[PDB]
Design a protein around this ligand. Structure first.
Ligand SMILES: Nc1nc2c(ncn2[C@@H]2O[C@H](COP(=O)(O)OP(=O)(O)OP(O)(O)=S)[C@@H](O)[C@H]2O)c(=O)[nH]1
Ligand SMILES: [Mg+2]
Lengths: 341, 846
């Protein structure tokens, strides 16, 4: 009947449902997983992402309590140049556009705009490619897999991906995080194996693109609260992550944004003794990451009743080694949970 | 139990004749061995001890080969009687010529013993008759043996043998009768479980298509069987592609059903629908259900086809001709508009109540509207079917009067109880035996043997305490402690059962063997005395038929034979030979006998557990089939159908509620595998509505059916008498309460819904209607009437988060204390302007 075996190889599979707001890393992490266990427009969209970022800075230049002025106003036409292509559906990306982007990227008024990135919706890998593309200002270059993982693609709809880890089947579903897409996630709520809720750790001082008035982290907190209580979700433990550890660490080292400013619960907060930080790790950063960690744990603490547990870890998506190690640990956890049924 | 007890033997007759054959075998063997014994060594001084045995032997073999007789089915009783009487005369005549001091008591004694046991076993005599014959034979034998303490001793032997015998006999008889009752109930269960299976099969086939019904007839995945007795409710729903779909609304059906008999409407409707069924089977199309003025069918959904479009449209033509005939057969100038469309559909069943297999997709609504936008008589076809219509039919681009559509026109008795009684009788008999063994010494004021009195008291206490165990086990006083009872009868296992019974039956022999160390061997009187004693003792072991065969047989064997062979050297010598002979033959008897009886016991147990399994199974089956019937139909209509072929029932009053999920289709994305998970969500919702029905107060409501996003409920139907304790029309309120509930319910459902909210609108009407059913082998109960399409097309015009209510209902409900903010006046098909009322008092700003 060829079905008596297929249902069991399904039972021999891992369903990995990914959650998290937009730009969290869901696309990033599924890209990572494919590389770790497994046709040219890729190079194109990157520029488009570039084309986005180069706009976002200049657009928001007039959208701050100071109108962000160039240190070199003579390149204002350059600005206007970008404002001339401010909405170009297609774009050949001519080399003069590359020059116009770079020249302002080295401008320090542009630098003052970029440094206040929190006060407006903006991609994360912006400054990275703002220098990486100077290497591919020409056209005969194939970007790095590092750029591939840093490629900003908007997740919209069920993106199923299968693979094998040492004779164990794994089937993850990339799913967007924007508000409208959240009407979809329900479709995947049917007997999924493990529920990877990632959160953009560094997105505590910024607001979501929905209303630009609700803190990205506070938003995701409310989200996770809701889902941790979902009448079909009280029975499967949750694996939690904190993406962009590095970016958060840079936020701390800059000391410009204040978590207590955004969330005063950190001022009166104490570092937990069970902290297992890496060598050469700012203890204040350890304090803050575990602060957020418990802030999410709190929700997984007020309920669950021993039927579904949290296992909060840490993650920097551009660090394939981080991904590998934490994912191996998660593989242990999920291969345990697989038979919990 | 008059001729039933007759039937008992009717199937007991074979085993009875078997037992009888083996019995006669033993009897003849005994007479033979006694003849040859009295011939070979001694007592050759006379031939009347052997020739009678020979003629009796040939009489026995004539009895044996005679049992093959045909005029026998009632006369066997007297056969047994007369055969016993022959045994009687033979033994007594061989007996009387004694009292010379060289004959022994125990010879003829043992003879009588065997006679009594064999009669008790096989001869089936009525308790009174069996008993009187036994006692008469005993007294006659002992009184002929007469030609002070010895005589009462022998009489005691007689009576205790009678006791053990009546015990065995009644046990055999009750076993027979009970076992017969058991096999009767078991065959009852077989022949009723078959028909329960058949009825539920008719059910499941009348609810699901043949293919998928027979799929459910595999009972492989017990998930659907777990629905009889947990995050997502389980359900089987598959996406299927490229099938055809056909709707048909009866043109002006309402105006047709104007003044029907509420019963003639039933017949004509079911008539035309049986016509349609007659079609679909031939046209190879699967009808699905019937929606009031409309009805619909599919083409090759379970079984994919390529001509499915042909099948469907030709079925449509058949419907056209059928409504034509009826239009001039009954002379009802009423036609039906019909529409068709082809595509893909997700098909399955949702909901736990009134659920029937159904189908959904945008293509569903497409064909639906194309019908309710299609002209009467000429089928409204789609481009989706025109692309492979293959123009073999009257292609006509039927443009509406307002997406590439076209038109076509052609071309008691407890095992424990047993144990208690048999223990009782065993201890009593052993008791009176040792009683005689004591009163054997009547001359001495105090008898010498003290160990006899010691073991007397000991075994007395042991058996009497086991008696108390049994009697507090039965009469259930629980005077000492129920924990003691439980922990102390846990030891009454199955094998320790064997061992404790073995010891309890062994004890009488050692008890009377308290008298073995003394001198008897000189006294030839005491010799025959103790011989009679030990044989009467060993023959007791039979009574615990609940105890094993090899075990009890070997135990009795050794415990009898050991000390007698021992004292064969302690003596009155040749009598040793004769007594060991009779002891041996008796052993073989009792061995085979208890064998066959323990067989009877194992058989009774087997039958009991078997019939018990069948009873459990029929219980479960009737449960499940009742559950499916209650799913498909209400209860009072189940009453009627059992007494009536059809059903029909008008109701001048009745409330009807429609709940339509507005934002479903927009919530529904198809970019997944048809987004069928959204339909899983829908099924979850419908189940959470079904649970609202099983509320006790909400048991009063009847869920009619569901139509995709539509949930349909009504009441005023189970109401068969207005009660003085209930306001007659208050159900309209509790029905309305239902609205207030589920409208709230979806919010909780929405509470588990992130960044989206389902919003349904609910339309309510009240008034007259009718209820009927479709047909047999295809069961479906439904309702119709003006209120029906009124409320349907009403809730069609409602607004979510608000309750659209008919104005006449609005009055009576306002009188029921409820608040409404006026909506206005709406336009209904065939009803023009109608005043409506919204329930929530300006739920929005105003
Ligand atoms: N530096 C750094 N950037 C990261 C990391 N993870 C994700 N990002 C950045 O986040 C941005 C968006 O990542 P993405 O994978 O699309 O998020 P998402 O969760 O999939 O969001 P969406 O696809 O539903 S819109 C990218 O520009 C990427 O550079 C990280 O670990 N370190
Ligand atoms: Mg994403």
């Amino acid at each position: 009947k060829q079905l008596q075996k297929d249902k069991q190889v399904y039972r021999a599979t891992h369903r990995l449902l990914l959650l998290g707001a937009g730009e969290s890393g869901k696309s990033t992490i599924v890209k990572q997983m494919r590389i770790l266990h497994v046709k040219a427009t890729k190079v194109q969209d990157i520029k488009n992402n570039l084309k986005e970022a180069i706009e976002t800075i200049v657009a928001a230049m007039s959208n701050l309590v100071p109108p962000v002025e160039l240190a070199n106003p003579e390149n204002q036409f350059r600005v206007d140049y970008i404002l001339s292509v401010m909405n170009v559906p297609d774009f050949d990306f001519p080399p003069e556009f590359y020059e116009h982007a770079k020249a302002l990227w080295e401008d320090e008024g542009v630098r003052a705009c970029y440094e206040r990135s929190n006060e407006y919706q903006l991609i994360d890998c912006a400054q990275y490619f703002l220098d990486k593309i100077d290497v591919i200002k020409q056209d005969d270059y194939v970007p790095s897999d590092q750029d591939l993982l840093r490629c900003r693609v908007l997740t919209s709809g069920i993106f199923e991906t299968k693979f094998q880890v040492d004779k164990v089947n794994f089937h993850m579903f990339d799913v967007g995080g924007q508000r409208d897409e959240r009407r979809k996630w329900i479709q995947c709520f049917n007997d999924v194996t493990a529920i990877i809720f990632v959160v953009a750790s560094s997105s505590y001082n910024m607001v979501i693109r929905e209303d630009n008035q609700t803190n990205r982290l506070q938003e995701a907190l409310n989200l996770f609260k809701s889902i941790w209580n979902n009448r079909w979700l009280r029975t499967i433990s949750v694996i939690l992550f904190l993406n962009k550890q590095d970016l958060l660490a840079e936020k701390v080292l800059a000391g410009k944004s204040k978590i207590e400013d955004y969330f005063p619960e950190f001022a009166r907060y104490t570092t937990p003794e069970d902290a297992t930080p890496e060598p050469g790790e700012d203890p204040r950063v350890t304090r803050a990451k575990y602060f957020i960690r418990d802030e999410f744990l709190r929700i997984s603490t007020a309920s669950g009743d021993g039927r579904h547990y949290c296992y909060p870890h840490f993650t920097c998506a551009v660090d394939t080694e981080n991904i590998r190690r934490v994912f191996n640990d998660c593989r242990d956890i999920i291969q345990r949970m697989h038979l919990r049924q | 139990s008059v001729n039933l007890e007759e039937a008992c033997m009717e199937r007991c007759f074979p085993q009875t004749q078997r037992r009888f054959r083996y019995a006669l075998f033993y009897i003849g063997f005994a007479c033979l061995l006694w003849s040859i014994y009295f011939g070979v060594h001694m007592k050759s001084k006379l031939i009347v001890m052997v020739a009678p045995a020979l003629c009796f032997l040939v009489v026995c073999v004539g009895f044996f080969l005679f049992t093959f007789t045909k005029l026998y089915a009632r006369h066997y009783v007297w056969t047994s009687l007369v055969l016993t009487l022959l045994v009687f005369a033979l033994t007594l005549a061989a007996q009387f010529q004694v009292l010379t001091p060289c004959l022994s008591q125990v010879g003829s004694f043992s003879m009588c013993i065997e006679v009594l046991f064999l009669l008790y076993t096989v001869m089936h005599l009525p308790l009174y008759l069996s008993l009187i014959l036994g006692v008469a034979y005993s007294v006659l034998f002992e009184t002929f043996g007469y030609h002070h303490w010895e005589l009462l001793s022998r009489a005691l032997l007689h009576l205790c043998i009678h006791a053990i015998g009546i015990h065995l006999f009644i046990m055999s008889q009750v076993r027979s009768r009970s076992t017969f009752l058991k096999v009767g109930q078991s065959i009852m269960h077989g022949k009723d479980l078959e028909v329960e299976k058949a009825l539920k099969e008719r059910m499941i086939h009348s609810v699901m298509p043949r293919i998928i019904a027979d799929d459910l007839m595999k009972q492989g995945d017990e998930e659907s069987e777990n629905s009889v007795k947990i995050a997502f409710r389980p359900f089987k729903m598959q996406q299927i592609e490229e099938v055809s779909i056909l709707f048909a609304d009866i043109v002006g059906f309402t105006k047709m059903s104007a003044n029907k008999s509420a019963h003639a409407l039933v017949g004509l409707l079911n008539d035309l629908f049986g016509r349609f069924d007659r079609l679909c089977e031939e046209t190879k199309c699967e009808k699905i259900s019937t929606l009031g003025d409309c009805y619909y069918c599919v083409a090759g959904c379970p079984e994919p086809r390529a001509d499915h479009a042909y099948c469907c449209i030709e079925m449509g033509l058949g419907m056209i001709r059928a409504i034509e005939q009826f239009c001039q057969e009954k002379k009802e100038m009423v036609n039906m508009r019909v529409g068709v469309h082809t595509g893909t559909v997700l098909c399955g069943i949702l909901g736990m109540r009134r659920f029937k297999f159904d189908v959904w997709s945008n293509d569903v609504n497409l064909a639906n509207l194309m019908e309710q936008l299609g002209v009467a008589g000429k089928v409204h076809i789609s481009e989706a079917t025109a692309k492979y219509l293959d123009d073999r039919y009257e292609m006509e681009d039927g443009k509406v009067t307002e997406l590439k559509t076209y038109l076509i026109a052609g071309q008691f008795a407890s095992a424990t109880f047993s144990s208690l009684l048999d223990v009782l009788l065993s201890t009593t008999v052993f008791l009176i035996l040792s009683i005689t063994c004591f009163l054997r010494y009547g001359a001495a004021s105090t008898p010498p043997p003290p160990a006899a009195l010691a073991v007397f008291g000991a075994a007395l206490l042991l058996e009497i305490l086991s008696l108390v165990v049994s009697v507090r086990m039965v009469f259930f006083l629980e005077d000492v402690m129920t924990c003691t009872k439980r922990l102390l009868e846990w030891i009454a296992g199955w094998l320790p059962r064997h061992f404790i019974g073995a010891i309890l039956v062994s004890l009488p022999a050692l008890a009377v063997y308290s008298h073995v160390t003394s001198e008897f061997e000189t006294n030839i009187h005491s010799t025959m005395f103790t011989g009679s004693a030990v044989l009467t003792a060993v023959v007791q072991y039979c009574n615990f038929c609940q105890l094993s065969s090899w075990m009890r047989s070997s135990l009795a064997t050794v415990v009898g034979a050991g000390p007698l062979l021992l004292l064969l050297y302690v003596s009155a010598s040749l009598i040793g030979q004769e007594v060991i002979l009779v002891f041996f033959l008796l052993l073989l008897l009792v061995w085979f006998l208890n064998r066959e009886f323990e067989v009877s016991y194992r058989l009774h147990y087997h039958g009991d557990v078997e019939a018990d399994l069948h009873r459990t199974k029929i219980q479960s089956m009737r449960d499940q089939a009742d559950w499916l019937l209650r799913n498909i139909i209400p209860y009072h209509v189940a009453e009627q159908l059992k007494v009536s072929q059809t059903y029909s029932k008008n109701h001048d009053s009745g409330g009807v509620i429609f709940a339509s999920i507005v934002n479903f289709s927009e919530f529904y994305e198809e970019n997944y595998e048809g987004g069928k998970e959204c339909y899983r969500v829908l099924n979850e919702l419908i189940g959470d509505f079904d649970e609202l029905l099983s509320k006790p107060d909400y048991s009063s409501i009847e869920k009619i059916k569901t139509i995709g996003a539509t949930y349909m409920a009504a009441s005023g139907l189970n109401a068969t008498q207005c009660r003085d304790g209930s306001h007659p029309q208050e159900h309209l309120q509790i029905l309305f309460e239902f609205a207030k509930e589920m409208m709230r319910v979806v919010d909780d459902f929405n509470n588990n819904m992130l960044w989206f909210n389902f919003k349904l609108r609910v339309g309510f009407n009240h008034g007259p209607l009718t209820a009927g059913v479709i047909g047999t082998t295809k069961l479906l109960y439904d309702i119709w009437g003006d209120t029906v399409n009124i409320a349907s097309r009403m809730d069609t015009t409602g607004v979510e988060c608000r309750i659209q209510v008919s104005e006449e209902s609005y009055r009576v409900l306002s009188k029921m204390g409820y608040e409404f903010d006026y909506r206005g006046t709406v336009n209904v098909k065939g009803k023009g302007q109608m005043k409506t009322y919204l329930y929530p008092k300006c739920t929005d700003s105003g």
